């Protein structure tokens, strides 16, 4: 199968470096130019760089000019992006993609789009230290269907995973995308809607798992 | 003079690239095609790929899809064969072949062929050969010369500056594990002539500008 | 009416050259000769001003800079022989300008074609858009390409980094009858 | 540096509708434009290249047209797997620029949000930080406005919002807004409320609490 | 791809006979896109026949061609001495334009046993720290021959290399050269060096030896 698998992303302090790799299979690697495209959280895709089939031609977005270097190893079917002097605005999910080659009268025409994309690899440029989240209860109100949840506050880096009653409770659960606070730590809320009658007759436990800090926190949400 | 002339011999280190040229003459290059075929020493013919001179469209074999690119230049009526990331396995002779054509029509086969280009790939360095005598044992006897440890191919051997040709066997060279070549050239002569006929083998190795005339002696 | 013929959004390929017919209207070829925008302004049979003819034809197409010299009477080459031939007694003008910023694409443009093979030369003002497989050998092609069986059209593959001789040029040929 | 604009920014469609998305370029780009479909958590998928060339595997209900500065993406009969964000990309010159995108949303009936307010927990206050959370649950359309008022004083610059993707069951959205104060400021006031205005609400809905009670 | 297979491997025939070579294709190929080539030692391939049955320019009319689809034939009515070389068939209709593995047409001959000679390493080479013992098998037919090195009756393995000449244009025989390579130290540790030759023309293996010194 035609497939692109990128790797090498992670957390890195500003000004430091990272090297992304892209493993291709299922097509003749040296017949195709290759692109690097990134997508910041909540934004659209941004083309970063492209390299020709033999590596002789390289183009870059102005934002990365002089800091990024694209390269390829045709003997290993591998594409590389060398990222130096990284900035906060470099934080994004990085895809490698294969060039669209338009054939007219048996002649190949290059740089016409991207047809085969990888799954993406995440890089996060931050000076923040790894930290597990504090899990605070959002207790259900006395008389105000009721709503309860957990506030998953002040953690770095992404992501957390939130379950309710160890995954048994899925009906009515809403775990929101995280916000990045001015402190550099993320905050997140996971809520659930339940019948008001079950509040005195049902435990609700939210389970917050944060692999980067090696922490798993379970909070019992109960009325006041 | 419907001709197809190729580049000279090439000797490159592993991991480099070679670009063999092939220039047309006699016919109108612009409307023909050029295929490339390689032949390892003592092996069969292997089709690499072809190119249509007018358009530049190429077709390659599966085994050369990764390291060969064929081009042409109608201004200099020449076709090229670029071979990247060389290795010992690439050591072979490469041929170019084309049908001759006028301004509108072509021959129905590959009838014009180039002289061939030998490409040697190894880590060895240029070195002249050491020539040792193969002395005749004490009605016909055999003597010769041992042309040992040279690089690259080839060497040329003659006997008595070309006077002695009957009964001479110059063997094709073998590639030793040291990376250098060894070659032996022998001749059978009547046993009577051993004491009254000097036998000299003439070894010339152009890549090293080596000219050795070695006299073979009955001990 | 020249405004929509010269400054058109897209031109035709040289093998499928387009002809616009202009009979009896307003014209001022003085602002065109004085323009450095036009890399070529050459007239034949009439010197480049305000004469009168019954009709004007506007043939337009795109070639590359090295080929603009072929758009003239008594010329030979890919364009003159297989794409667009001007007669020896041609009475008109040929105008061209560099259209790299419009018709060139990074990686190569695939929209402009030119005829690469043809068994005989075009008559003056002949238009050939056939896509029959060119039989270069004696063996008949049966619609399939291969050895001595080539597609007759080829793409220019215009790129902005190309040499100016290989960059696209939009050509307008005015003939007066 | 060729810019690209798309219109509209969002579309609310049903299964079977004809949907047309347009892409405007800041300069002529001939036929060198492509269209991409992207779903949450997935890489963009190429649908059309060269203005009107359907990528292999794409259903023929997708079509594309245009030339120069204006281009059009048409979905003849929208199918459930077509609700996504669509991007247009030009390829005349580097850098390859994308459009801002057009989100194809599921049209449904106006549902008012259920509003819940949550005071900061006693454990969090012991950390010296207070977070008040306002939940807007299962509403449509997505457009909603939350205003925080602390003793009837309208807040600004001290809150953050987050919206869920459109729900796979009832096609509604959910919103969570968090007001963040220090424990010092939180204990200086009594009434904490979030005022919610939404299309399903004939008048702003307010959920409040008195600190401690 | 289309695999082209040729037969026979070696065609041992007398000058003046009729030669017949075969070329097979893994699938049916157009007759107008098959060629035959001839290659002599140290030369480029030469086109003989194309379009299965179309003689090339300058090729003698004794060269003929036939076949269709998967089986093709190269007939030589009367074999001349300038015709003993290798012959290839290539199809150039469907890409890739694959070749056959070749057929060697050699002059058939009567069995001739080799004349065997052994050569001790020269005193000049021993000064360099290496010894090369050479065994010459002179003018024999058929080509197949076997050489074994024995050093004080110890059969050697992995330290010898062979080389065979092309068939002689005058007596139609072959010659072989085998070189045993030992260091000067290992060479002086033993006394009797011999090469045993096995060949069809010999009623029993022939051994040629020398005594290190005398
Ligand atoms: C260009 O050549 C064609 C064909 O030439 C053939 O192939 C050559 C390599 C050579 O082998 C020639 O002897 C071949 O004829 C010419 O076309 C032929 O013209 C003759 C003239 O009577 C006609 O009988 C044939 O049928 C034609 N064959 C084909 C395939 O067209 C053509 O005339 C040559 N053009 C010029 C300008 O010389
Ligand atoms: Br390229
Ligand atoms: Br590189
Ligand atoms: Br190509
Ligand atoms: Br345009
Ligand atoms: Br108070
Ligand atoms: Br082959």
Author numbering:
A (entry chain A): 1 to 144, 149 to 228
B (entry chain H): 1 to 138, 144 to 224
C (entry chain E): 337 to 384, 388 to 516
D (entry chain B): 1 to 213
E (entry chain L): 1 to 214
How do the authors describe this structure?
A second V-region that repeatedly confers potent (IC50 < 0.1 μg/mL) neutralization is IGVH1-58 (mAbs: 55, 165, 253, and 318). Three antibodies (55, 165, and 253) harbor a disulfide bond in their CDR3s, compete strongly with each other for binding, and map to the neck epitope but do not compete with mAb 318. In mAb 253, the disulfide brackets a glycosylation sequon (see below). In contrast, the H3 of 253 overlaps with the glycans of mAb 88, and the glycan of mAb 253 makes no direct interactions with the RBD. Although IGHV3-30 is found in 11 RBD binders, none are potent neutralizers. H3 lengths for IGHV3-30 RBD binders vary from 12 to 20 residues, suggesting they bind at different sites, as confirmed by the structures of two representatives, 75 (in a ternary complex with 253) and 45 (in a ternary complex with 88). 75 binds on the right shoulder and overlaps the ACE2 binding site, however, the only HC-RBD contact is via the extended 20 residue H3, whereas the bulk of the interaction is with the LC, outside of the ACE2 footprint, and ACE2 binding could likely displace the extended H3 loop. Thus, for IGHV3-30 antibodies, the mode of binding is modulated by H3 and not focused on a region overlapping the ACE2 site.
S from both SARS-CoV-2 and SARS-CoV-1 uses angiotensin-converting enzyme 2 (ACE2) as the cell surface receptor (Hoffmann et al., 2020, Li, 2015), ACE2 is expressed in a number of tissues, including epithelial cells of the upper and lower respiratory tracts. S consists of two subunits, S1 that mediates receptor binding and S2 responsible for viral and host cell membrane fusion (Walls et al., 2020; Wrapp et al., 2020). Although both regions are immunogenic, the RBD contains the interacting surface for ACE2 binding (Lan et al., 2020).
